[PDB]
Amino acid sequence: GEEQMRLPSADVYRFAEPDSEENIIFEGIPIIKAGTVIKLIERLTYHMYADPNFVRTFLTTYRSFCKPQELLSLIIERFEIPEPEPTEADRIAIENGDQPLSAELKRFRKEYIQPVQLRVLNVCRHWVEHHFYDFERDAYLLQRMEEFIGTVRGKAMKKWVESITKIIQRKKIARDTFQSSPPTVEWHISRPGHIETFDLLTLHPIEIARQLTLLESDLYRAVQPSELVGSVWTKEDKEINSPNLLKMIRHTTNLTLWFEKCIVETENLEERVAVVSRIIEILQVFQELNNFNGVLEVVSAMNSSPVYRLDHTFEQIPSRQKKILEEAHELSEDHYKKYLAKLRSINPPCVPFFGIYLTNILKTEEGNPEVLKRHGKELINFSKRRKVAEITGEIQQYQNQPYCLRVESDIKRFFENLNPMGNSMEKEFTDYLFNKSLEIEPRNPKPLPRFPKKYSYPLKSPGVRP
Ligand SMILES: COc1cc2nc(C)nc(N[C@H](C)c3cc(N)cc(C(F)(F)F)c3)c2cc1OC
């Protein structure tokens, strides 16, 4: 009918075929459940209406079903719409040197070409504003984009190309505050500048939790939603696709294993009790600062196979410290029911627990198919990508929460350069920590031997009250 005859032909344009059950599925503006790459590009730049929500989700998750170079090629192809031939009367008019009426041509330009071309430029604008890392990783992709927007010609196009260029240059320049003063940097045995003496018991427990909270807050903020889509941090290409996310995981692994190392490598029972007691105090300050990432790193260390079995150590831990640690584990029970209720009720700033998002994203990635088949044709399951994008939205909700705490470069460097494993691998190092646990506290039939002290300085804690 008239409705399809107005649109371009399939032999000159791929984004004008009619919708059908074997190319697009849906769950006002309709929500797309699934579709082919072409139908998703068509709807990403639809002529009848703007769709900010779909544009957001598409540019966060597209890399799981389409490469950046391919997406750029597709939207340029969509922008290049062929105009219809003049009507028979208008071709007689043109062949006679007269101006044609061109009534349908003028309408097709106003109601289809101009809106689609403006929607393609909106996609380019959101792409460089919220996902510039695609262009930093691929310099060939940036020069292709700049050649395209640079050759665009038009009245309304003029303002759009200028704003896209303004963003690109501002992002290029980006590659090259608090109402209150921060509290006083606390010191215990180690004096400022004496980096050689820095360790768990020599540094102040308040300042350890403060500097780790600043470090973990900075790491949490650097992660981009795209680093988590398609489980790309578990794939072969992860150092370039998930650089910030891997630093967050590696820090959590290094710190959790460092706490375990500090515990099992302290063979004297009474000294080991003071180490555990100090790590619990460090967790108390993480609770004060609403750093749930830090609280659940300590819980992870206390629940590990080498530390959880040290019954003689936790027997000497006061009941108050025991209750603090027990309630911290309760944060994780019932699929983090208590943690989530706490996170929603607290006042900012905070560092949310990051592992729950990776867990829930991997469950969605494994529990939903990549495609949906209909009439023998495979369609990209876009709702799968939308569910993952909603979880990464929860992550962004807390990435604008800086802390009024003074940075101490020597202490920051100590926690950044943590290397408990040394030249050993994780499986081999955890085997060592468990075998060490059995040495310091043997299994029931075997007796409990005594070991010599290793710390020359005093073991008493200065506390957590500043
Ligand atoms: C069914 O499994 C578990 C149940 C748990 N229930 C509770 C209440 N706390 C736990 N863990 C906390 C973090 C903790 C660890 C250690 N090492 C010492 C103490 C304490 F009490 F001595 F201080 C507390 C649990 C860990 C479990 O599995 C690993």
What is the spatial distance between Cα 69 and Cα 71, in angstroms, rounded to a whole number?
6
Do 105 and 212 share a domain, yes or no?
Answer: no
What is the spatial distance between Cα 245 and Cα 241, in angstroms, rounded to a whole number?
9
* Domain finish residue from 337, 364, 397: 397
Do 402 and 390 share a domain, yes or no?
Answer: no
What torsion do the CA atoms of 226, 227, 230, 232 make, to the nearest 10 degrees?
150
Do 326 and 368 share a domain, yes or no?
Answer: no
Do 429 and 337 share a domain, yes or no?
Answer: yes
Q: In terms of Cα–Cα distance, which of 57, 36, 55 is closest to 46?
A: 55
CA of 350 relative to ligand 1 center, distance in Å? 24
What torsion do the CA atoms of 313, 356, 291, 457 make, to the nearest 10 degrees?
30
Experimental approach was X-ray
Say if 177 falls within a structural domain.
no
* Domain finish residue from 397, 425, 455: 397
- Domain of 461? 183-354+398-466
What is the spatial distance between Cα 414 and Cα 195, in angstroms, rounded to a whole number?
8
Do 59 and 19 share a domain, yes or no?
Answer: yes
Do 222 and 364 share a domain, yes or no?
Answer: no
Do 168 and 294 share a domain, yes or no?
Answer: no
What is the spatial distance between Cα 399 and Cα 222, in angstroms, rounded to a whole number?
8
* Domain finish residue from 340, 369, 397: 397
| DSSP H stretches of helix in 132-204 | 133-137, 139-151, 155-174
Indicate which atom in ligand 1 lies nearest the CA of residue 303.
29
Do 377 and 403 share a domain, yes or no?
Answer: no
Lookup result for tokens 């769709």 = 51
Residue nearest to atom 29 of ligand 1 (CA): 303
What is the spatial distance between Cα 16 and Cα 8, in angstroms, rounded to a whole number?
6
CA of 213 relative to ligand 1 center, distance in Å? 23
What is the spatial distance between Cα 390 and Cα 6, in angstroms, rounded to a whole number?
38
Domain tally for the chain? 2
Q: Ligand 1 pocket: which of 276, 308, 316 to mutate (most atoms <8 Å of CB)?
A: 308
Write the CB contacts of 172 (distance below 8 Å, at least 6 apart in sequence). none
Write the CB contacts of 308 (distance below 8 Å, at least 6 apart in sequence). 302
CA of 262 relative to ligand 1 center, distance in Å? 19
Do 276 and 204 share a domain, yes or no?
Answer: yes
Name every protein residue with a CB atom under 6 angstroms from any ligand 1 atom. 299, 302-303, 307-308, 314, 317, 322, 325-326, 328-329
Tell me the three state secondary structure of residue 460. coil
Beta-bridge partner residues of 372: 379
CA of 315 relative to ligand 1 center, distance in Å? 13
Do 218 and 97 share a domain, yes or no?
Answer: no
Do 343 and 464 share a domain, yes or no?
Answer: yes
